[PDB]
């Protein structure tokens, strides 16, 4: 038929966060280098 019956959410919490934004052409992508953030002293190699 025509289904289109995927439900929407409840407009969740929108916080401000220092992340890193660039734009490549039409698309707008993060940049993430996760060494000093999540892997600093953890002694597990970067994947």
């Amino acid at each position: 038929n025509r289904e289109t019956l995927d439900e929407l959410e409840s407009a969740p919490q929108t916080t401000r966060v220092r992340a890193d934004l660039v734009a490549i052409g039409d698309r707008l992508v993060f940049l993430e280098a996760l060494e000093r953030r999540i892997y600093a002293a953890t002694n597990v190699p970067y994947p």
Binding site: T42, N43, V44
Partner: protein, 49 residues
């Protein structure tokens, strides 16, 4: 104090660590002089005016 990250499956399990090292102070003394000549003494302290 260090964090850790949970490893999934066939690895040893990472438990936390705390590292303590004390450091000992270096000591050092700086020397510097300034002289004063003999005829200059008797003028400033008096009893040669």
């Amino acid at each position: 104090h260090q964090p850790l990250i949970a490893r999934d499956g066939p690895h040893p399990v990472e438990q936390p660590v705390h590292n303590y090292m004390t450091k000992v102070i270096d000591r050092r003394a700086l020397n510097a002089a300034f002289s004063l000549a003999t005829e200059a003494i008797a003028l400033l302290t008096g009893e040669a005016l």
